[PDB]
Amino acid sequence: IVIGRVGLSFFRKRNMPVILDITRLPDQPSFADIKEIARKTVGLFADGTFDELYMYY
Amino acid sequence: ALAPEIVGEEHYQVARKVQQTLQRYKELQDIIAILGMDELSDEDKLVVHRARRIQFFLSQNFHVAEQFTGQPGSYVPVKETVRGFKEILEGKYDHLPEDAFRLVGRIEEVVEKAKAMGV
Amino acid sequence: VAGTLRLDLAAYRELEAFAQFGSDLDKATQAKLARGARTVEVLKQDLHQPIPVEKQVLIIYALTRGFLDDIPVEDVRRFEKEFYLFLDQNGQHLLEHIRTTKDLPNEDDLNKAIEAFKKTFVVS
Amino acid sequence: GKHVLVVYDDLSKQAAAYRELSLLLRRPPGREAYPGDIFYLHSRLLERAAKLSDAKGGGSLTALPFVETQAGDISAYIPTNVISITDGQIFLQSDLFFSGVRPAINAGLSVSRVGGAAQIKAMKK
Amino acid sequence: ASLRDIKTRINATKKTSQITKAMEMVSTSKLNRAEQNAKSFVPYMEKIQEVVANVAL
Amino acid sequence: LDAKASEHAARMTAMKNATDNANELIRTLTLSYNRARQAAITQEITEIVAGANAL
């Protein structure tokens, strides 16, 4: 799961399995800006799609 | 002879606007070559987009240059060229590829060339 | 009025590189950019049409006192032309005062005349 | 009535030689110490290559003058003098040469003033 | 290099320098705003951390 | 939020470095321009005088 079009382009050029992205975020984002993406990410853990979360920043 | 009372107000305004756009485009090249096109504002991006098409549309195929171009030349009346440049400035042809504007003549020839190119 | 005009123009020239970043309203210096743009519009002039010194003084006074701050920069030339016509019609006392004493008229009278013209000007 | 090909392997070297002769003969110099008629020298030489008419026998002479530039400066005095005379030029660049493209012809700066008429019909097409 | 070429390079570099200086100052203001925005988030994070530590353990 | 702060700080530092490098380049280019200007003036004046006293 990638936040940012530069990382999106990186992974697309290296042909990697990206499933989610936001690609457009304000300079001073609020919680409502990433509420949906965070909700989907945490839901995918309980959904059984994958059993581990690592995050890099 | 480029005065409002000689060529007409519309001709004068179109010519001055074309010159202003090209002059603005000249200044943008220095910073484009360093920082890329992505860092420009939306107004500067539109300026570049229209200036490239204007510069290509200033080209023409001459009758005496068949030995160099491979195609017959064209003759363009001043009313036609004024109207074509006015339409380009207004943005009627922003969706056309910029290579379709090279060495054509009238503005309808740009549309025909782009149609042949498959747009 | 010339000192204020020069200060505004110099401040604009110093901040010209920030014009692209004012599009998202990054800070409150954008008033200087707007004033400089209007100053540049005011200083333009056509061929073989010199302006009398009293009219030049009045238009520069209007610019530097903020009366053009709500006129779009695309309308400043037409504003100046219509203002000169309005002056010829109604501000003859102000023009005569400037011509005779070489000094500005009363500030209140100038403000009243400018506002009277401004409520009749129509923004394009 | 024959056809001739002539190659001058360096015109800049006779330009230097003519400058040397002119200075030794006490003729006052001009730009870059070159004599006044440095253009006339090369124009007089190169105007004698031509394609004769049918009444003159139809023979031809064609010329390939050479000019060596310094650091790729095509806008120097002698290079511009020679360019203003001939019917086109082929410009070779070191940066193209090392980037892998050989014979390294710069298409933007090269031109032929006879182009098209000097080609087979198929090649023209 | 000729005088014209050197003069063109000088002017281009001056324009680039002005643009970069403006970008630096804009980024400085944005960094200040981002720091205060991050500061405004601390109490909620502290509260939820304390609640989770109390309950889940 | 941490990432956004890091990004803004990184942009500020990078643009500061770019501005400093551009200023240094401007200085060196101006020095070379002045040398070329002086050399030119010397060359034309020498050629003029050589032609003049060649007569």
Distance CA A41, CA A37 (A): 6
- In B, which residues are within 8 Å of D116 by CB distance? 66-68, 70
DSSP annotation of C24 reads G
| Closest CA relative to residue D124, chosen from F23, B67, A21 | B67
In a domain, residue B71? The reply is yes
Contact C97, C110 (CB under 8 A): no
Bridge-based pairing of strands D3-8 and D60-65 is parallel
User: Chain D closest CA to F22's CA: distance in Å?
Assistant: 26
> Rounded to whole angstroms, what are the CA distances from B110 to A38, B21, B95, B116?
49, 21, 12, 10
Chains E and A in direct contact, meaning 3 or more beta-carbon pairs closer than 8 angstroms: yes
Three-class SS state of D6? strand
> Residues D108, D110, D111, D115: is their CA dihedral positive or negative?
negative
Give the count of domains, chain B: 1
Residue E43 to chain F, least CA–CA distance (Å): 14
Determine the residue of chain A that is closest to E38 in CA distance. A28
CB D90 within 8 A of CB D105: yes
CA–CA dist C18, C38 (Å, integer): 16
A26 and chain F in contact, CB less than 8 A:
no
Contact predicate A44/A38, CB 8 Å: no
B79 in a structural domain: yes
Q: Residue D5: in which H helix or E strand, if any?
A: strand D3-8
User: With touching defined as 3+ CB pairs under 8 A, do chains B and A touch?
Assistant: no
Region label for A22, one of left (φ > 0), alpha (ψ between -120 and 50) or beta (otherwise): alpha
Torsion sign, CA atoms C107, C108, C109, C115:
positive
Euclidean distance between the first and the last CA atom of chain F, given in angstroms as a whole number:
82
Residues in E 1-40 with any Cβ partner in B closer than 8 A:
11-12, 15-16, 19
**Rounded distance between C-alpha atoms, residue D54 and residue D72, angstroms:** 41
- Looking at this protein, which amino acid is placed at residue B69? T
Residues of A in contact with F3 (CB under 8 A): 57
Determine the Cα–Cα distance for residues E10 and E19; give it in Å rounded to an integer.
Answer: 14
Answer yes or no: is B26 within a domain: yes
Alpha helices in F1-55 (DSSP H): 2-53
What is the Cα gyration radius of chain C?
A: 15
Nearest to E35 among F5, F16, F30 (CB): F5
* Sign of the alpha-carbon torsion through E10, E11, E15, E18: positive
CA A23 – CA A5 distance, rounded (Å)? 5
Q: At what angle do helices B9-35 and E3-39 cross, to 10 degrees?
A: 70
What's the CATH code of the domain at B111? Answer: 1.10.1140.10
CB pairs under 8 A between B and C: 5
Beta strands D111-112; D3-8: pairing state: unpaired
Q: What are the phi and psi torsion angles at D4 (to 5°)?
A: -125, 140
Find out whether B85 and B18 touch, Cβ atoms under 8 Å. yes
> Chain E: nearest CA to F48, how far in angstroms?
21
Q: Within a domain: residue B40? A: yes
**CB < 8 Å & 24+ apart, contacts of C25-30:** C26/E26, C26/E29, C27/E29
Top residue of E28, E40, E41 to mutate, by most chain F CBs within 10 Å, is E28
Q: What is the CA radius of gyration of chain A?
A: 12
Looking at residue D4, what DSSP letter applies? E
Does residue B85 belong to any structural domain of this protein?
yes
Q: Are B98 and B56 within 8 A, CB to CB?
A: yes
Residue B30 is assigned to a structural domain of this protein: yes
Q: How far is CA D99 from CA B33, B43, D72, D92, D95, in A?
A: 21, 37, 16, 13, 6
Rounded CA-CA distance B88/B106 in Å is 12
Other CB atoms within a 10 A radius of the CB of residue C60 amount to 17
Structure tokens at A3: 């936040």
Q: Are E33 and C25 contacting, i.e. CB atoms less than 8 angstroms apart?
A: no
Q: Which residue of C has its CA nearest to E19?
A: C17
Q: Name chain B contacts of D117, Cβ cutoff 8 Å.
A: 67
Residue D108 Cα to chain centre, angstroms: 18
Contact F4 A57 (CB under 8 A): no
Cβ atoms B56, B79 nearer than 8 A: no
Contacting residues for D14 by C-beta, under 8 A, at least 6 apart = D41
Integer Cα distance of C109 and C96 in angstroms: 13
**B1 belongs to a structural domain:** no
DSSP line for D58-120 = S-EEEEEE----STT-TTSHHHHHHHTTSSEE--B-HHHHHTT-SS-B-TTT-EETTTTTTS-
Cis peptide upstream of residue D103 (ω within 30 degrees of 0): yes
Lookup result for tokens 């003729």:
D27
Give the gyration radius of chain F's Cα atoms.
24
Q: Which of B41, D29, C122 is nearest to F49 (CA)?
A: D29
Closest CA to B113 of B90, B93, B83: B93
- Report the alpha-carbon distance of residue B28 to residue B44 in Å, rounded: 8
Let me know if residue B95 belongs to a domain: yes
Q: Please give the full DSSP string across D8-41, using - where no structure is assigned.
A: ES-HHHHHHHHHHHHHHTTPPP-GGG--TTHHHH
Chains F and C touch (3+ CB pairs under 8 A): no
CB neighbour list of residue C49: distance below 8 Å, 6 or more residues apart: none
Active-site entry in D26, D27, D31, D113: D113
Residues D81, D85, D88, CA angle at the centre, nearest 5°?
110
Structure token pair of residue C39: 């100053």
Residues in CB range of C97: below 8 A, 6 or more apart: C103, C105
Domain that holds residue B66: 7-117
Quick one: DSSP state of residue E32?
H
CB atoms inside a 10 Å sphere around CB D72:
12
Would you call D19 a catalytic residue per the annotation?
A: no
The DSSP line for chain B is: --SHHHH-HHHHHHHHHHHHHHHHHHHHHHHHHHH-STTS-HHHHHHHHHHHHHHHHT----GGGHHHHSS------HHHHHHHHHHHHHTTTTTS-GGGGSS--SHHHHHHHHHHHT-
DSSP A25: -
